[PDB]
Amino acid sequence: DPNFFKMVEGFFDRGASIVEDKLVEDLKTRETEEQKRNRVRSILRIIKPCNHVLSLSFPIRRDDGSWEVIEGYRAQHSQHRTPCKGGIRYSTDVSVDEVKALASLMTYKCAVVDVPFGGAK
């Protein structure tokens, strides 16, 4: 029973240590054999983190005239294909760490089935 956000990011780092080699060879450009390495390792650092993350705060007025502060989140992982699609969850245990995770997970989920828009949550 390991942490989850480590699991997802754990796969990406693992799956990038595999494709990295067969991917340098299939590049076309006027570079060295080492400038390509610095080009692949580099793009793979750009795909990994989450571009945008927001954080909100609401003045809601309860039914009994009271007030309280609701607190939300939304993370858009990638912008490479627009829009971004991602569900909304209502739960008292929605951290900002698990929103980054599930957002990144959809950018790859909706890529294996060739659905254009990127990931969010």
Add this chain to the structure above:
Amino acid sequence: GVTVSYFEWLNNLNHVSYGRLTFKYERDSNYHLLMSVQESLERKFGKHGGTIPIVPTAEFQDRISGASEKDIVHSGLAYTMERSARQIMRTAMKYNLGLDLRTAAYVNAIEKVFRVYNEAGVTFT
């Protein structure tokens, strides 16, 4: 520098420097006041023939010839920083805070930021 940052935002938002349309206008109005004091006296003491050369001071002249935008800024600042102290002095009495000023600073802020949520209907429902 927050106050002057507010003045720069207005300068960039009026699309004209400060006073460009008024410096030479307010300059003439000063010399016509002096020439008015001169004439008015020389209608009473004037039969004696003595001229009365009413003229600006050597400092008030150094204020007319070099009147620029820089003066209006260093003025609107000295007016903010003064109108605002009188409100901290006051609050330091309305709550009997003595020589605790820091608390009176935050008390003014909260008491003004409160009057904006209250008279607005915070909820859009």
